[PDB]
Design a protein around this ligand. Structure first.
Ligand code: NAD
Ligand code: NAD
Lengths: 452, 452
């Protein structure tokens, strides 16, 4: 075989471009819950069998397949990728890898156990920018880094939404039940899909899922990060079902092993989104935009400051100097899609992993999705202390409760303001947190077990 | 110590409580543009003459008066206060003192020149919390302070509004033209007044004017701040007519003279609003809410960290120490209103200033309203350098521009997102900045000249 047999799952949007990148291989089956939105894609590949439920497609065609591309809404990435991998299939899974920390940990351990090739779809990991960021840091060009600031201008779509009140009929071209997948059932509405799932906690991850995997990748790889020890967030109005218009997250990562030319001390990483930006770094010329391609990253080293854009693009040092550092990272010639295909075909003993192999991308996505935890737990009024190995917070009190705003009810009558707002009934904070870290799947939807 | 003859201007909201605080004096005339909203207040003082235009009331009654209470929308405070002061009258003017930098500088110099008693309406300046904050700092209890963080949970009303497009008839109880005052004319709508002027750049100052004078007072007086040297801000979606949902501002203030027990080095002050908070200070117990009575302040000293709420309330030290520091500030026994009345009656040669005398409140309000500048100028992508003496920024390029969003146009059609936005026509940034610092008054409305 020179051609992989690939099944595509979630094809109408980003999946479309990913499949174009994989087109030289064999697209034998395509699954999409929405046969209207995805129609143009099924008709670029007339020969592939059409499905509208991945489980049906898997039962019929996982024999014929080597690999699965997944570009569904975030909340279903895990269950799909896990079923594919446990059947011994290679997987390309769009960023963010999974909806939850637990799901990321599971995909990481499954990739190892079944020895398949994996690729999270953060395509910047395969470009030149990151390679420079890493090589500069590792060669001592900026000294040690105790503080990084990062941001995106996303969200650029409306968030902070309330559950829409009208009921809508489910189009006959849409398999609403399979869209819901393991999440709690709720009535259909177009506000949820296509595309707009990003703002709903049960289905997407807000700006963190939209952008963070692109923005933070050079931070995570360059500073060799693992599990954070602490995290805290704040946001604009935090609703119970929808993510906020803007948020800030501060992580702390412990010291790692030093490298010959650069120490790796404890490091704070700040995240800003929704218009908020870090303060301008000292020495940067007035007027230089910190946003390049949707965001920025600032590494504050003891000898200099390294700044890059989203996707690791166009790194520079604020001193103006251009280093000439030793090359250490594999220089990737294929697209992000095709570099994975290469890996899929090398024997497992011998395999050169692609750039977003889940052995990196898993722990990385756990940082991204921890942003969501921090923000959703902000009313606990504490720095949250994370035990990474055991996937729990250690300092949420037994009797703490958490509630969220359902709807802002501000009104003015004849000049007199009223500040009403509905709140959810307080729930136990530890159980709410535990459930965000690891969801209770709706009956009929099951993850494979954690190995061992 | 007979009774002051007081005129009131802007009486239907806050003015109502302020008049209650002054009621043992003679309320001889009241002016309000809105005779429906303000009716209950006119009828608590049936012997005062009623007016709906301050200029009319001043031409008839400034002879008879000693003092004027101003609690109008922000954009009219300065012209009213200034006309009163130039006639030799004492003034109580609600926070924020003025809409603009220039107007604050003018009210400051008029107060000195005419030797009248003044009081900005930040009533926290007369309570005990700030005395403790100041006394602890000045006695060296927390060492030197290089960093302060501050915030409020406001706005708790909707901002980010677009100009309404419907035609609304002017109620016959409303003097819309006198509401506009020196601002640019626009069509009437109830969205602007009463109360809701706060989020419109032409009339209010957003969360900064609603809360900052309350929150930052202990910072400004405790660290003996004057003019900042630098400022920068970011926000959620910055619109052309309405303030954003949330914002951050960083000020830098230069070193002042040291006091015997505490040095006064260069200090950075941060401001956050609309849900955003500063990261939790090191040492603060888990669970302790940083918001007390609407926000909070954190002073990071070399020896300890001092935290207070809004209004300077309930100051404490993170180490748990409670100092016993020498008393230095006058212990104010009368209300914030009546402490001003006392000052009004002392001869100017002898006068003990009330706690929000414009000699402090003027420069303080300049910091507040500088936050508005920073946010409205954020597209310049630079830390702005402020020359306080000359009321100008020194590093805005002569050909730079500013454009703002008029209306977000996001929509989804058949799952495809479209991201359009209308923008204003770019204007020259120096002219735009100069105009925010010093408004061009609408024809027929003039300030007194700056004294020298
Ligand atoms: N790498 C990048 O640059 C990038 C860019 C855009 C999107 N993404 C990611 O790709 C994913 C998809 O987002 P999008 O913008 O393509 O969204 P979208 O909703 O436009 O397209 C998703 C498609 O998947 C289908 N789908 C959803 N759930 C399904 C399920 N359970 N089974 C089968 N089909 C299902 C939908 O019907 C739709 O056609 C998200 O993970 C998003 O984070 C990555
Ligand atoms: N010190 C505090 O704690 C505190 C609390 C609330 C309000 N404020 C301040 O008080 C001021 C008033 O705000 P508010 O909430 O009372 O607003 P409001 O709109 O409820 O009341 C303002 C009143 O003044 C009238 N008014 C407006 N412009 C006028 C003008 N040019 N001439 C005459 N009357 C006019 C309005 O009709 C209304 O009666 C604002 O500057 C606000 O910052 C201070």
């Amino acid at each position: 075989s020179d051609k992989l047999n690939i099944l595509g799952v979630g094809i109408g949007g980003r999946g479309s471009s990913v499949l174009r990148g994989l087109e030289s291989q064999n697209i034998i089956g395509l699954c999409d819950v929405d046969w209207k939105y995805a129609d143009h894609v099924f008709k670029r590949y007339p020969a592939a069998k059409k499905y509208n439920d991945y489980r049906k497609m898997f039962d019929e065609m996982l024999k014929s397949a080597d690999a699965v591309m997944v570009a569904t809404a975030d909340h279903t990435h895990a269950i799909i990728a896990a079923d594919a991998m446990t059947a011994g299939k290679h997987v390309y899974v769009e960023k963010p890898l999974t909806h939850t920390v637990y799901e990321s940990r599971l995909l990481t351990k499954l990739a190892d156990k079944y020895k398949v090739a994996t690729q999270m779809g953060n395509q910047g990991a395969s470009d030149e920018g990151v390679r420079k960021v890493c090589e500069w840091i590792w060669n001592g060009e900026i000294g040690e880094v105790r503080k990084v600031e990062t941001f995106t201008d996303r969200p650029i779509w409306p968030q902070g939404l309330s559950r829409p009140e009208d009921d809508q009929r489910i189009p006959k071209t849409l398999n609403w039940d399979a869209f819901i997948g393991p999440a709690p059932y709720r009535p259909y509405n177009a506000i949820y899909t296509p595309w707009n799932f990003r703002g709903w906690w049960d289905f997407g991850t807000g700006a963190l899922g939209d952008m963070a995997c692109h923005i933070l990748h050079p931070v995570f790889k360059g500073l060799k990060l693992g599990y954070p020890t602490k995290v805290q967030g704040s946001s604009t109005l935090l609703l119970n079902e929808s993510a906020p218009m803007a948020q800030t997250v501060k992580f702390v990562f412990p010291a790692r092993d030093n490298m010959p030319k650069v120490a790796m001390p404890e490091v704070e990483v700040y995240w800003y989104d929704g218009g908020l930006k870090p303060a301008r770094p000292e020495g940067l010329p007035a007027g230089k935009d910190l946003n390049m391609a949707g965001g920025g990253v600032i590494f504050y080293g003891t000898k200099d400051t390294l700044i890059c854009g989203c996707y690791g693009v166009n790194p520079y040092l604020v001193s103006g100097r251009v280093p000439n550092a030793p090359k250490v990272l594999r220089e990737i010639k294929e697209s992000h899609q095709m570099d994975w295909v290469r890996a899929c075909k090398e024997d497992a003993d011998d395999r050169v992993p692609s750039a977003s192999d889940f052995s990196e991308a898993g722990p990385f996505n756990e940082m991204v999705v921890m942003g969501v935890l921090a923000v959703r737990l902000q009313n606990l009024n504490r720095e949250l202390l994370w035990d990474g190995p055991n996937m729990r917070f250690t300092n949420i009190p037994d009797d703490a409760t958490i509630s969220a705003v359902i709807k802002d009810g501000f009104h003015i009558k004849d000049g007199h303001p009223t500040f009403d707002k509905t709140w959810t009934d307080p729930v136990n904070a530890q159980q709410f947190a535990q459930e965000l870290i690891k969801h209770t799947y709706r009956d009929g939807w099951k993850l494979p077990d954690m190995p061992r």
